[PDB]
Amino acid sequence: QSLLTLDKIFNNATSNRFSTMAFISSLDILTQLSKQTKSDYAIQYLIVGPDIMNKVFSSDDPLLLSAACRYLVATKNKLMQYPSTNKFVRMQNQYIMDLTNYLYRNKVLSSKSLFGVSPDFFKQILENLYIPTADFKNAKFFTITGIPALSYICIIILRRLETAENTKIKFTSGIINEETFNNFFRVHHDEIGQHGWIKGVNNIHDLRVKILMHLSNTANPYRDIAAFLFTYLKSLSKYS
Amino acid sequence: QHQMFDPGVADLLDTDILTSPSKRKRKLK
To answer: Which residues, if any, are the signal sequence (chain B)?
Structure first.
């Protein structure tokens, strides 16, 4: 795991899906190892350090993020019988709070740090970073539809949900964010109000939940992100 | 003004290339 995550083969610019396959194979073996109760292995051999986990969280590979969520789900279900305050339990807590904040919460700037980086630098990157519309800039692209590996995936899922319900209205914008969602309801308010779109959804959060329902179906290799969001979120605990 | 660099490192970095294309053209040929 230490050799695979070095930025000589496995980068964010020069991609290498071979290294991702080796990494998700290692994560799969870790998940299958964490389910064996009869073996009294040491607790320190399931963590890989923070420096690997935050790096692979920053990586834009949807299968690798799914494997990371699977690893977190397995290691928490193993760590529940462990004491609630150890050297590595708070480490797993840091992992899940950073990943949930990066994935669903959109509260990165209010947090103490994200992936070991304080949000002042994260805001200063947003400064001098021009966006054509400044309606909602600091919360537009820090979510499940704002992840580089999961932006267009959510749009595919939304289009398949529109096709399944035979909706006459199609989401014309090619990005799912709060501004585009509000403009989409603004342009077709009377059509949305009666019929012709996804049922049971009235806000962007409900849209994300309805997307997470379709990612939990038995047709995608992205089961584990939906289970991760359904597990460590009290609002989403009822959708398990 | 698009200050691309940090002020701590912009002092030793020649930013004048972006303002003046003639400087770039004389630094190529």
So the answer is: none
Q: Which residue in B has a C-alpha nearest to residue A124's C-alpha?
A: B6
Q: For A126, which residue in chain B has the nearest alpha carbon?
A: B4
Name the token pair of A93.
Answer: 């807590």
Identify any residues that bridge with A117 across adjacent strands, giving them in sequence order. Answer: A114
Locate A92 and state its tokens.
């797993």
CB A108 within 8 A of CB A119: yes
Which resolution in angstroms does this entry have? 3.4
Smallest CA–CA distance, residue B2 to chain A, in Å, is 6
Q: What three-state secondary structure class fits A224? A: helix
Q: How was this structure determined?
A: cryo-EM
Question: Residues with Cβ < 8 Å from A197, sequence gap 6 or more?
Answer: A162, A165, A167, A169, A191
CA distance, residue B20 to nearest chain A CA (Å): 21
Residues of A in contact with B2 (CB under 8 A): 128
